[PDB]
């Protein structure tokens, strides 16, 4: 199945020149990119073609940081005001309640809402499984909607953890180039389950293959409980290794991620919503540490617009370094090739032949870019943030004109309202 986009007002591909191409567009074949260029030198027509005149197309937006299921109890009256201990002790009140459906039509939720921002790869971390929840029931949404996703098998404390850990790896994990699915080996913290375990799962991950990924350094008080040294003591360090938040990671722990190629997950709303306060991005990559964007779990966000997390990381750099601690670029490459980077993935964040067919197109003609032509790039950056006209994940069509177009959508979020307030009902 070939698909063609011809016309591009600007086309940003994040190629290994970093090529921004004005009236161009992408010819694919099946799932992969096996041409970008000017439109005049790409085939004239395809199965399914796409003249995206008048758009600007970017790579794929990666999301590096979630918990999708939170997203049944976004505002949550006792949760909005609170400080992370109180945060905590209310949400898990309601988190208890969870069943294998809630999971299932949360997974659906925060994915269309992803999807309609212009992300196209994913990854998530459910840390809990309530009543006879599963990982599957996440992975069968992802499935359904059609987004590239890395399944996180996230826990808190044992035994189980690694049985099951292992069971989702042999069961769902793709290794081949062009994944949909793949596993990561999640506990939650360094201290929410025992160095044990930390250890297993470092050895059980590097033994398959996969990644591994955990909250690390995010406020004051973990460090008065360092948190880098903690990580490479027990191995979790590495390309295949990545850390939410670190807003508060020393400058050992930044040299020490760099030299290693430890990623993180910088999530910027998240960080402000809950006041942990104003990660050194602008330091990080300085250093050299691979950094990607994530909009985290929606209990504290509460939304997810990828082009809104991608500002809010520019102007948060801003505001606490300076005007020239990050640029439009800089962000929107940090949201796409640094997201695919810390997910140690390579076919996946640029536009080039031999990579992903995932892409976001945005119309350049509604009044929110109104005189911001100039740099139609950073303008996706500088405006307010804009919903994708187009988004393409593996070469299919997911959202048409603003629209899910693999599922219908309405009769979801309706379902979605309908067990989120059960949900709450069931813990007051
Ligand atoms: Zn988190």
Redesign the pocket.
């Known amino acids: 199945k070939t698909l063609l986009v011809k016309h591009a007002d600007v086309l940003v591909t994040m190629d290994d020149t970093r090529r921004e191409l004005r009236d161009a567009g992408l010819y694919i074949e099946d799932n992969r990119i096996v041409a970008v260029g000017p439109s005049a030198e790409l085939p004239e027509t395809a199965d399914e073609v796409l003249d995206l005149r008048g758009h600007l197309v970017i790579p794929g937006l990666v999301n590096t940081?979630h918990?999708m299921y939170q997203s049944l109890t976004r505002a949550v009256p006792a949760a909005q005001n609170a400080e992370l201990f109180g945060w905590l002790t209310n949400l898990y009140k309601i988190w208890a309640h969870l069943t294998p459906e809630m999971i299932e039509v949360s997974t659906l939720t925060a994915m269309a809402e992803l999807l309609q921002s212009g992300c196209t790869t994913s990854s998530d971390?459910l840390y809990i499984y309530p009543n006879g929840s599963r990982l599957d029931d996440s992975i069968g949404a992802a499935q359904r909607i059609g987004m590239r996703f890395h399944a996180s098998r996230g826990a808190m404390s044992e035994p189980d953890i690694l049985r099951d850990t292992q069971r989702l790896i042999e069961t769902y994990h793709d290794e081949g180039r062009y994944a949909m699915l793949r596993v990561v080996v999640a506990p939650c913290s360094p201290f929410s389950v025992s160095r044990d375990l930390m250890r297993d799962a470092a050895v059980l991950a590097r033994e398959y293959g996969v990644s591994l990924h955990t909250?690390l350094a995010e406020n004051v008080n973990d460090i008065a409980y360092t948190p880098a040294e903690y990580a490479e003591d027990l191995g979790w360090v590495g390309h295949d290794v990545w850390h939410?938040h670190c807003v508060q990671l020393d400058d050992a722990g930044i040299g020490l991620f760099a030299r290693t190629g430890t990623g993180v997950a910088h999530c910027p709303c998240s960080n402000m919503r809950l006041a942990s306060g104003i990660a050194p991005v602008k330091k990080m990559r300085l250093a050299g540490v691979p950094v990607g964007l994530g909009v985290?779990?929606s209990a504290s966000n509460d939304g997810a617009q990828m082009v809104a997390e991608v500002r809010q990381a520019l102007l948060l750099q801003r505001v606490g370094f300076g005007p020239d601690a990050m640029t439009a670029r800089e962000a929107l490459e940090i949201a796409t090739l640094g997201g695919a980077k810390v997910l140690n993935r390579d076919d996946i964040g640029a536009l080039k032949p031999g990579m992903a067919a995932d892409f976001a197109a945005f119309d350049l003609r509604q009044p929110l870019f109104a005189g911001a032509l100039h740099d139609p790039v950073a303008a996706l950056v500088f405006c307010a943030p804009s919903q994708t006209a187009y988004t393409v994940v593996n070469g299919k069509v997911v959202v048409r004109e603003g629209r899910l177009a693999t599922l219908d959508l309405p009769p979801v979020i309706e379902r979605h309202n309908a067990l989120a307030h059960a949900l709450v009902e069931a813990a007051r």
């Open positions: 940081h918990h971390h909250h939410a985290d779990g």
